[PDB]
Design a protein around this nucleic acid. Structure first.
Ligand SMILES: O=[N+]([O-])c1ccccc1O[C@@H]1O[C@H](CO)[C@H](O)[C@H](O)[C@H]1O
Ligand SMILES: O=[N+]([O-])c1ccccc1O[C@@H]1O[C@H](CO)[C@H](O)[C@H](O)[C@H]1O
Lengths: 330, 328
DNA sequence: TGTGAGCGCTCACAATT
DNA sequence: AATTGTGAGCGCTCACA
């Protein structure tokens, strides 16, 4: 037994709609009849049923999110900012976390987000061009925002400019004098992983450079260590490395270190993300800064824009920037 | 206007209650008329309004979570597993984040988590005893399970055994022949931080040892850094630290190293958490394994047991380990 | 395999002063 | 021209021609 709108009606000697009228801060209640209702809602701890209100047709803002596992670093900070900017403007956010692999798994997360009748979907799951389109199709009537697709994918999306990110990493190493460079890509299953790899290649090629090695991790610090050992042990030893995130950069550094040479001097490392923890690596990691707050922030503002039918369609690139630290010098 | 049950009624040639049995799979395998309704709903892509299902009274188990900012390590990881184990059981979960400081914030979080009509909530927010009680109260008719309160707090709680963690660490550093030990604790605002500090004090005393330094971090590596630097610049130079988490430990190590001394041999370190990244710190960091996935899994099971009446009231401690690494 | 309830609200607005 | 009370029904599930 929870407390109905009707209950406040009997205790306060008014109708139900006049409680609704007050709960909804609506015009026309004489201000002295308000006290009767305002006092009655206390003395009953009345919290109005939002399930009842949604159905009734209250225009609340409800943003759905289909997200990669919150255990990973970046999808987590994004949800947090998404969540934060919701409250900031009176929106609520239900988030279905895609855990299993592939297009069908993500579609179900879109399916039961649609169940709860969301005003629009933020899709932070990695989707290839066609599957992205497949999913955006499934968002029937509701606008959908994509955060882990390519800029070439012909839907709406926010991505950090991986072009800029890699340009900075490449043009740095290159200006520094490096030529034997190795690449440590993210897991190829991720779009963003692939884009950064692509990017490095473009700007290396534009500088007449070919990476001596190129291998793949899973974002994890351990992989980046394993991968930079599998490399160094084969005897391929670059003067610099481009890593696809700070955690794997960490791994590489460890491997580079345990291998008997010094980070920066003997092998420079450029990370990717600029995490909290990256300013306290040994030595403190040079990286490409991605403002996940800003992403989740805009990610919301846009979905709500799109929800209202504002002309803000397609792709937009967020800025990145190079954090110069101690892993590239002398 | 989206697809209604009243719209599958005069397209498949039946009623509303017939489509209701199809998606529910409740009692009868209603002939070859199922085939007709299957192809009917899938043609217009009908998705049963879960808001209408709920108001109606569908016995779907919906958990609420009031949680510290997911940007921090431990909380994210926990919801990560809370969201997972509930999914494993066919429970959905709505999380509500506390950013603002204090009790009134968490009270409000609980308030708008009740509107969504959860059938019990997991409170992963740091709460002093009387506030924890006041929060549990506001959870009208619904069971609360607290995750960032003390063992002594008289509500439902799962916490990791801070007693064991802090034993493990102290009892280990000491067996390595250490007497000049320092402490780096969590931001004192967090209960679990204080539980850890306390367990350290407890066991360091049981071993006739006074800590030569006590400094307060904020979970961040930067704080763990400058917090160890501002102590080493004072002149205090232990041979071991006990640190509240792997992350501040990280900054400690930076600080120790950048100063001019070998992490491990000159000043050993013990972190707390066993984060994925901890195994690749330079050198790999000794720490206390705190199985976040476990905690989030068990939380969800308990709130469930709690919701149905299965009487397992009170407090529950979870095991920890010492991953013996290379900073000792 | 159908019909007539009611869940807690918000919207029309018609009814009270 | 101030107010408030009263009539739908939003979508679905529950118990029984
Ligand atoms: O993959 N992304 O959609 C994405 C969006 C914003 C910033 C980075 C990028 O996320 C990437 O995520 C992976 C795990 O999913 C790792 O956390 C990696 O460190 C991060 O850069
Ligand atoms: O504070 N906790 O509720 C808690 C539960 C399980 C394990 C550790 C402990 O979490 C602690 O949380 C803080 C930030 O929330 C840091 O992430 C720290 O590393 C973690 O140990």
């Amino acid at each position: 037994k929870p407390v109905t709108l009707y209950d406040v009606a009997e205790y306060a000697g008014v109708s139900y709609q006049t409680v609704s009228r007050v709960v909804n801060q609506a015009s026309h209640v004489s201000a002295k009849t308000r006290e009767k209702v305002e006092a009655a809602m206390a003395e009953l701890n009345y919290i109005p049923n939002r399930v009842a209100q949604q159905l009734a047709g209250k225009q609340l803002l409800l943003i759905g999110v289909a997200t990669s596992s919150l255990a990973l670093h970046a999808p987590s900070q994004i949800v947090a900012a998404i969540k934060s900017r919701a409250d900031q403007l009176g929106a609520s956010v239900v988030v279905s976390m895609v855990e299993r692999s592939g297009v069908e798994a993500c579609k179900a997360a879109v399916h039961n987000l649609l169940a709860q009748r969301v005003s629009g979907l933020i899709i932070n799951y990695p989707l290839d061009d066609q599957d992205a389109i497949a999913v955006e199709a499934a968002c029937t009537n509701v606008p959908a925002l994509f955060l882990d697709v390519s800029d070439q994918t012909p839907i709406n999306s926010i991505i950090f400019s991986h072009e800029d990110g890699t340009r900075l990493g490449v043009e740095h190493l290159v200006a520094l004098g490096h030529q034997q460079i190795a690449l440590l890509a993210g897991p190829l299953s991720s779009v963003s992983a692939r884009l950064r790899l692509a990017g490095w290649h473009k700007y290396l090629t534009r500088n007449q450079i070919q990476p001596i090695a190129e291998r793949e991790g899973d974002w994890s610090a351990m992989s980046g260590f394993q991968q930079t050992m599998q490399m160094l042990n084969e005897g391929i030893v670059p003067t610099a490395m481009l890593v696809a995130n700070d955690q794997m950069a960490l791994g590489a550094m460890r491997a580079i270190t345990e291998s008997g040479l010094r980070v920066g001097a003997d092998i420079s490392v450029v990370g990717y993300d600029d995490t909290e923890d990256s300013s306290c690596y040994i030595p403190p990691l040079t990286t490409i800064k991605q403002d996940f707050r800003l992403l989740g922030q805009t990610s919301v503002d846009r979905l709500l824009q799109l929800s209202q039918g504002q002309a803000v369609k397609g792709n937009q690139l967020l800025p990145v920037s190079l954090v110069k630290r101690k892993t590239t010098l002398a």
